[PDB]
Amino acid sequence: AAPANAVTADDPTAIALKYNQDATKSERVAAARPGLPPEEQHCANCQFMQANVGEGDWKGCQLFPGKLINVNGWCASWTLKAG
Numbered sequence: 001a002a003p004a005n006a007v008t009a010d011d012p013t014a015i016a017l018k019y020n021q022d023a024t025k026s027e028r029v030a031a032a033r034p035g036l037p038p039e040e041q042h043c044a045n046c047q048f049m050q051a052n053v054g055e056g057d058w059k060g061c062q063l064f065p066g067k068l069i070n071v072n073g074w075c076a077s078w079t080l081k082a083g
């Protein structure tokens with residue numbers, strides 16, 4: 001079950017960024033964002049995931065203030081976690 005503040009499929013920004021809480025149900029291959037092969041991309045290896053926000057599999061994303069994403073998710077702003 002998702003937290004009460006999970007990003008939902010109906011969120012305008014989630015729709016624009018093609019977020020899904022499950023990267024295996026995402027269009028990461030179509031987008032071909034740079035930095036890793038697409039099949040390797042998900043929130044846990046993204047620069048915007050906030051490891052100090054949330055609990056467990058439900059962590060912050062800087063692009064979704066006040067909400068939580070799933071570490072196993074993906075969106076089209078995926079960017080390699082570089083620091």
Ligand code: SF4
Nearest residue numbers: 043046048049061075
């Ligand atoms: S920006 Fe990164 S951490 Fe945030 S939802 Fe998209 S892939 Fe996940």
